[PDB]
Amino acid sequence: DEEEDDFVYFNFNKEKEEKNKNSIHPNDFQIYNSLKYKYHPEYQYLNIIYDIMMNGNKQSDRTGVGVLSKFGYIMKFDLSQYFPLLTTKKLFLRGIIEELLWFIRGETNGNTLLNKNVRIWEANGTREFLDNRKLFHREVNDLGPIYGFQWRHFGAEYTNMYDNYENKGVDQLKNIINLIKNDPTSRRILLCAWNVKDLDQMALPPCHILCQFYVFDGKLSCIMYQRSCDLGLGVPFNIASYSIFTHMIAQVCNLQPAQFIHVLGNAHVYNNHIDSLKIQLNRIPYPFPTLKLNPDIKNIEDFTISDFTIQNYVHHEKISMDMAA
Amino acid sequence: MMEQVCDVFDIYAICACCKVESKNEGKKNEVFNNYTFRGLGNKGVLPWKCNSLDMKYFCAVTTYVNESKYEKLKYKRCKYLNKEKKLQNVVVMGRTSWESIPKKFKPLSNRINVILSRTLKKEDFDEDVYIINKVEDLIVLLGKLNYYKCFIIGGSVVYQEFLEKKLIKKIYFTRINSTYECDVFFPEINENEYQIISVSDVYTSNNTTLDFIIYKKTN
Ligand SMILES: NC(=O)C1=CN([C@@H]2O[C@H](COP(=O)(O)OP(=O)(O)OC[C@H]3O[C@@H](n4cnc5c(N)ncnc54)[C@H](OP(=O)(O)O)[C@@H]3O)[C@@H](O)[C@H]2O)C=CC1
Ligand SMILES: O=c1ccn([C@H]2C[C@H](O)[C@@H](COP(=O)(O)O)O2)c(=O)[nH]1
Numbered sequence: 001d002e003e004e005d006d007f008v009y010f011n012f013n014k015e016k017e018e019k020n021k022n023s024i025h026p027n028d029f030q031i032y033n034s035l036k037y038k039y040h041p042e043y044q045y046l047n048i049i050y051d052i053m054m055n056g057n058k059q060s061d062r063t064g065v066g067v068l069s070k071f072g073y074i075m076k077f078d079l080s081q082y083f084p085l086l087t088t089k090k091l092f093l094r095g096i097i098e099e100l101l102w103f104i105r106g107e108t109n110g111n112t113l114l115n116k117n118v119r120i121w122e123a124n125g126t127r128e129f130l131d132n133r134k135l136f137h138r139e140v141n142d143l144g145p146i147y148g149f150q151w152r153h154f155g156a157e158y159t160n161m162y163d164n165y166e167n168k169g170v171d172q173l174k175n176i177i178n179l180i181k182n183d184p185t186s187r188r189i190l191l192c193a194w195n196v197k198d199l200d201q202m203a204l205p206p207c208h209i210l211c212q213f214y215v216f217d218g219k220l221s222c223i224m225y226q227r228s229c230d231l232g233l234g235v236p237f238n239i240a241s242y243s244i245f246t247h248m249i250a251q252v253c254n255l256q257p258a259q260f261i262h263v264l265g266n267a268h269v270y271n272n273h274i275d276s277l278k279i280q281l282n283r284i285p286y287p288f289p290t291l292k293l294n295p296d297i298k299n300i301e302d303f304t305i306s307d308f309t310i311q312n313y314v315h316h317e318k319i320s321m322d323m324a325a
Numbered sequence: 326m327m328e329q330v331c332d333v334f335d336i337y338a339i340c341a342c343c344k345v346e347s348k349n350e351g352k353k354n355e356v357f358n359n360y361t362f363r364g365l366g367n368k369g370v371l372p373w374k375c376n377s378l379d380m381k382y383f384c385a386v387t388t389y390v391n392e393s394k395y396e397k398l399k400y401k402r403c404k405y406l407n408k409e410k411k412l413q414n415v416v417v418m419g420r421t422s423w424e425s426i427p428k429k430f431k432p433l434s435n436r437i438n439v440i441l442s443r444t445l446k447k448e449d450f451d452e453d454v455y456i457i458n459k460v461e462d463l464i465v466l467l468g469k470l471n472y473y474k475c476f477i478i479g480g481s482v483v484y485q486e487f488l489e490k491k492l493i494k495k496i497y498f499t500r501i502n503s504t505y506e507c508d509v510f511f512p513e514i515n516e517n518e519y520q521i522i523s524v525s526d527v528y529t530s531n532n533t534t535l536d537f538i539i540y541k542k543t544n
């Protein structure tokens with residue numbers, strides 16, 4: 001027990017809990033702090049929310065709302081054990097799956113998503129938005145050389161959302177699927193959306209910079225780097241999105257999904273989301289559900305909405321991260 | 326202060342509940358809560374079949390002992406009752422529960438088995454087990470035995486009565502995240518008598534996700 005005191009000395013430079021930034025009130029997280037062991041994977045997400053509220057930096061941002069922020073976090077999810085769809089609040093995946101299938105097809109036409117009643121990109125394709133981005137000659141909803149285009153045609157000159165870019169640009173997706181299939185030990189299996197040259201032509205730069213894969217013992221793992229992370233609204237979907245993507249790639253390559261690793265760069269919490277998050281942090285996670293993919297789909301391009309099924313999703317009630325009434 | 330029996334005799338409960346087939350509340354707009362997991366048994370056996378991981382967990386908890394902690398426990402129970410190998414835990418179960426166990430496992434290994442029954446007496450069992458017809462008798466027995474912790478592995482009827490009397494210091498509850506047909510359920514835990522204090526990692530076993538949460542008797 002002699003070690004006990006050395007521990008105390010070694011903390012001689014951790015000063016008072018007043019300069020702990022943002023005047024946070026304990027009482028707002030009693031349930032959260034009462035817990036002794038918080039091993040449910042959802043706590044990787046929640047714990048970051050807590051850290052950002054308790055130790056975050058007060059910054060302004062492109063929007064003006066104002067946010068609390070920290071830099072550099074990492075979360076790990078075991079897809080062979082569960083599907084990480086947050087349970088402390090309700091989530092729907094139809095949208096993000098349609099978005100994902102949309103990316104895989106190399107599409108950049110927002111209308112396609114809107115006709116499926118998926119408005120994820122609606123705000124980024126208005127006349128006003130496009131014009132504020134200086135894309136005066138861009139048709140409404142023509143998102144530009146974003147994700148989809150970069151995944152299948154990186155390098156190709158973007159014209160418009162109706163053009164036929166076949167055999168133009170580098171088809172990264174096709175490439176990584178081949179690398180996992182034929183060269184599984186390669187340390188060069190990356191998918192990159194951050195095309196430096198086309199950034200200003202995109203409705204807006206991608207938040208998911210890159211994905212890198214790892215193959216071992218017939219199991220595929222994925223690491224995704226996110227430059228800007230909206231813990232309140234974005235991240236929950238980002239986690240789901242790539243977990244699903246890892247499953248698909250894993251399948252069409254005859255492998256089993258393993259770890260989905262999420263690296264957060266600029267991790268922020270929008271001030272106008274704080275009340276909702278407080279509420280959320282005091283809810284105890286339910287066991288995660290599972291994801292089922294039609295097994296007959298052998299090509300990454302042959303997936304359709306009906307080939308995805310989420311089972312046993314037990315979750316708390318829906319929460320608007322921006323409550324008024 | 327007036328020490329509680331469950332505290333002096335370290336009496337806990339451990340179970341595994343799945344989701345009940347509440348026909349048609351089942352599609353969306355369905356509300357969920359801790360009572361979503363309440364299915365205990367069906368047709369004198371488990372709703373879901375068997376869950377390997379859940380079993381590994383069950384045996385791990387109910388057989389684990391810490392010898393270096395007994396002396397402290399002995400002193401406690403003795404002082405309480407006004408007094409002065411291979412330590413084992415005690416498992417208490419209802420008769421129905423005892424019968425639903427395959428003969429190859431009876432009596433549960435490395436554990437002092439105690440069965441609650443009114444229709445059966447020691448002469449009706451061949452195994453090395455203790456029989457009792459009253460809950461009050463368990464207490465007397467515990468006062469006379471050497472053991473680490475006492476676990477009510479239940480039977481829904483047993484769980485129910487041990488919770489009313491407040492004989493549970495903690496509840497090791499397994500949430501089976503899938504639905505099966507059931508006919509017996511665990512009592513609805515009162516958010517005021519008990520509160521979750523720990524939630525484990527999530528796992529997959531026998532085609533279903535599941536986790537383990539620990540409820541604790543509030544002050
Ligand atoms: N999911 C899980 O974790 C578990 C599920 N189960 C399932 O539960 C079901 C069994 O539960 P259930 O039917 O409630 O039965 P129980 O195991 O609770 O057995 C009830 C019987 O135990 C005896 N008993 C209970 N209390 C007393 C008392 N105070 N004094 C004397 N005898 C008492 C009686 O036996 P007698 O009839 O002889 O008088 C009584 O009718 C099964 O389907 C089993 O598979 C069981 C354990 C765990
Ligand atoms: O998949 C996504 C897309 C966007 N965002 C968030 C991060 C930022 O809050 C905002 C984009 O702002 P900039 O980083 O572009 O400034 O959208 C996410 O969290 N996930």
Ligand SMILES: N=C(N)NC(=N)Nc1cc(C(F)(F)F)ccc1Cl
Nearest residue numbers: 339340341379383426430478479499
């Ligand atoms: N599985 C749990 N966590 N709970 C439980 N009490 N189960 C349980 C399991 C068994 C068997 F598997 F050995 F047959 C026997 C008796 C009980 Cl009470």
